[PDB]
Design a binder for these strands. Structure first.
Ligand SMILES: [Mn+2]
Ligand SMILES: [Mn+2]
Ligand SMILES: [Mn+2]
Ligand SMILES: [Mn+2]
Ligand SMILES: [Mn+2]
Ligand SMILES: [Mn+2]
Ligand SMILES: [Mn+2]
Ligand SMILES: [Mn+2]
Ligand SMILES: [Mn+2]
Ligand SMILES: [Mn+2]
Ligand SMILES: [Mn+2]
Ligand SMILES: [Mn+2]
Ligand SMILES: [Mn+2]
Lengths: 107, 98, 87, 94, 94, 106, 82, 98
DNA sequence: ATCAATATCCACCTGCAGATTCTACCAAAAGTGTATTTGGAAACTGCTCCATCAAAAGGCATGTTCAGCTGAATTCAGCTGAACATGCCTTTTGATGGAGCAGTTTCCAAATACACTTTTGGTAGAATCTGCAGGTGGATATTGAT
DNA sequence: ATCAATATCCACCTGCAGATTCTACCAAAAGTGTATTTGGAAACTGCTCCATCAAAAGGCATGTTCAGCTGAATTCAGCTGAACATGCCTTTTGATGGAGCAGTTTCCAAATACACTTTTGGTAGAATCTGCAGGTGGATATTGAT
């Protein structure tokens, strides 16, 4: 036998996603390709966020991704920042950003 | 006796806190405020410890982001000092009081 | 169960230095003396609103314990989605 | 009662992009919230879409449109390719 | 193909509240939008409430909690009393 | 046969509300009282706005409620204004309001 | 004399909008700024409306496509169906 | 030659436009703008008439409310003249820029 | 304070776009009756984790002193916007072929429904691993007085 | 521009909480295999209502003049930041009773599932009805110069 995830070439669980779609009461019926397409998208978005967060971790000389790295990744990326524009990542802190007029001296 | 000029340490504090992520309000005092408020809504409630931490993470993120907007309002008025009217303008534009 | 101390004035537990720290994370360099009380008032409204909804979810489920999920759902309803606590 | 999470799948993907990088439990909890959040957002957009069109079925076509409505520019483009590819492959395997 | 709306029921209510007041087409369309909007918000909130509590059924209780979550203070109190009254009256009738 | 609406003492259609709830994919099942309670809530809110809207038509010396009146009724009512805080009433205009600092120094 | 479409949103039309918004005095630079803001607003709403149009396999953008677009953008509009 | 002082007529217009509800942008030019933007997303589209009107009712209500916030920002800076930086501040706080 | 130029009201009037009244048609609903199916309440209870008391101590909150420099006030002149008069081009309005939005009919690819069979994600418990928090020391900037 | 008082950078190194490492159990999944059902793509087509043209119609573009607004320059009272002394109360580490959350089984009140009878809301066409939008007249207020 073979998982629907293997037939679709995915890491994310097509079976699980199909089930969650049915239990969520989104529609009377859910076609076979729906969970495949959805699992694929979720997998792609998670690959994207982990790619950037692992880079933030590397930048900070860390080998383990922590919430701060997820936040730096999201907030420093225009599109992920927008997609998560109303989301708060716990223990994420904020991006270093001091308004110019507040700096001392001149020039 | 050495003295940094006013504003120097403030800027140092900004860099320090924008670099870290730990919560800034003391934990027990925040937990008591949560319990006091909740108690006035409904008596005899219990709280999972993570429910109080969730409220704290959300409350601090909310306040930090409101101070960013407040700051922009003060700067807009050619000031560097935030004042109650800046917080009020920020909340009004956000639709929190509009 | 005997007694249970009266909770009052705990908004004052949100101290001047804690508020100063929160403003520093928010990039603020100078703060008027009236800001502290104003911030407490704003935090109280924020908390009353989220706690009201969270407890509403708690009562609906007929529980006496406010769960992290009751708070996550309350935050989500208010457009303040929070990640990290099961939500 | 068993409580599910996308943790093992997030971990598999983490290993593909950054082989020697790990993830703390709190970050994994954030990743699990993220996946559930986007799942619900896309599923809800798909549901409304189907209802608006008087369709009782959510097919990959509703997921694709929901994805376009929900995701910013470049992410929508890439998500669309990956999902389309996954379905074309899926349908070729049986 | 039939196009249903709340127009006739909004009109019956108008007559109860202001017997000699009419309502223009555009205004009625606004009222229809209002009713559909509140229906969806209340229903969606009730839906989430039942799912959160792993219940397959949306009963008057989920409608009630949805109302308390969605409507501002006094509006919620009167809506709750009106709803409770109607279910009572309804339940007491051969 | 007596309509569910009449049994509930309502003007709004219980039967239709039940149907809309079932097909809206809100839950696998819908109890009997849900559509009654919900219809009553929709009726009440409707009466509230029409009540204030009609009053606005009256103050304006009009017998027919138009969008403007619904907007005046909603925006002048603290609670309705918040309920409809993210809603735009077409052809509603805005409430008369000039910031004091903009008025001439009489 | 030709005319860029966004320029069809004229200074007087913008001033009227501003007046209903309670505005007493306007900087000359406001007009172009407003046009830019309005274009972004329309691009965001129309993009979604057209996405609903295409999903329905239609060639005509309907009021409902617009209502649904406005609603998902948090700009719910009453009076045009839905 | 009679002449109203600067501002007297402005105030008169505010009162007039806040009393009415008609659209303030002319229809055809708005329609052209709408079609042009849509053509970039999908060519050869038609529009129901009510679709363009809904877009205009929504667009105008959006700009009018934005002008209200813009006005509060100019007033916050002790001015009575709105400037681009006022619209920018309002949009940023609304989170349309943020 | 005195007109004088205009804007703003209000009482009245009435044609008409749009709301109302009425007859007729009927698929769509909605209500009633019958039988089966089932979600989730009460009942009992295992077991997590919440409230609470204890003790110790140092990370911080509090309260004060001192004065740097910010906000607030005042003054003033350049110049940008408001008001307005002058003149025509883009918009609005009303009339007319078709682009397709929909209503109808046909038909199968594909989605429930259902019984097994097999695989797998959780997870309870014990065991060993491993990234980095946290403190230390010292060389390198940063600040601020002179 | 030199020089000191201090913050900041940071690579290295040890103890440990949190993390990735296995063993065994498995119910809940997920998947494989026939039967039965049906949602909606596809094709044809009628009826809207949309795009476009002509012309009757109602702003907008443009240059002139100057009122008054914005913002620059100046001043200074006193707020608010920085530093400091003191010691309170939060934090940390642990233990414990037990409130109550959550698992398991029983079992009916209420919901789904048709099938059938009745009523009803929506649509189409015909024709009469009506609130009020503009248009007029004269009165009076508002505004701004003198
Ligand atoms: Mn109390
Ligand atoms: Mn059961
Ligand atoms: Mn002390
Ligand atoms: Mn200053
Ligand atoms: Mn100029
Ligand atoms: Mn054709
Ligand atoms: Mn396994
Ligand atoms: Mn370290
Ligand atoms: Mn069919
Ligand atoms: Mn017990
Ligand atoms: Mn009827
Ligand atoms: Mn009139
Ligand atoms: Mn006259």
């Amino acid at each position: 036998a073979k998982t629907r995830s293997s037939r679709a070439g995915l890491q994310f669980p097509v079976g699980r996603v199909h089930r969650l779609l049915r239990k969520g009461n989104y529609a009377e019926r859910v076609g076979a390709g729906a969970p495949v397409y959805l699992a694929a998208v979720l997998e792609y978005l998670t690959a994207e966020i982990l790619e950037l967060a692992g880079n933030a971790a590397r930048d900070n000389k860390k080998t383990r991704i922590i919430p701060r790295h997820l936040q730096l990744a999201v907030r420093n990326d225009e599109e992920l920042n927008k997609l998560l524009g109303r989301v708060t990542i716990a223990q994420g802190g904020v991006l270093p950003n001091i308004q110019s007029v507040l700096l001392p001296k001149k020039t | 006796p050495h003295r940094y000029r006013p504003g120097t340490v403030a800027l140092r504090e900004i860099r320090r806190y924008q670099k870290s992520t730990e919560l800034l309000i003391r934990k027990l005092p925040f937990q008591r405020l949560v319990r006091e408020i909740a108690q006035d809504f409904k008596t005899d409630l219990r709280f999972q410890s993570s429910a109080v931490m969730a409220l704290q993470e959300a409350s601090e993120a909310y306040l930090v982001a409101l101070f960013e907007d407040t700051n922009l309002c003060a700067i807009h008025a050619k000031r560097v000092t935030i004042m109650p009217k800046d917080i009020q303008l920020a909340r009004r534009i956000r639709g929190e009081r509009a | 169960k005997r007694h249970r101390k009266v909770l009052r004035d705990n908004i004052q537990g949100i101290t001047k230095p804690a508020i100063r720290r929160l403003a520093r994370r928010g990039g603020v360099k100078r703060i008027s003396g009236l800001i502290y009380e104003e911030t407490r008032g704003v935090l109280k409204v924020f908390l009353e609103n989220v706690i009201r909804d969270a407890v509403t979810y708690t009562e609906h489920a007929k529980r006496k314990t406010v769960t992290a999920m009751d708070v996550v759902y309350a935050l989500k309803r208010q457009g303040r989605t929070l990640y990290g606590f099961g939500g | 009662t068993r409580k599910e999470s996308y943790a093992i799948y997030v971990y598999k993907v983490l290993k593909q992009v950054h082989p020697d990088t790990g993830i703390s439990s709190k970050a994994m909890s954030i990743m699990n919230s993220f996946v559930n959040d986007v799942f619900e957002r896309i599923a809800g957009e798909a549901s409304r879409l189907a209802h608006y069109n008087k369709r009782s079925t959510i097919t990959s076509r509703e997921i694709q449109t929901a994805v376009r409505l929900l995701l910013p520019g470049e992410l929508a483009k890439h998500a669309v390719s990956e999902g389309t590819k996954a379905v074309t492959k899926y349908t070729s395997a049986k």
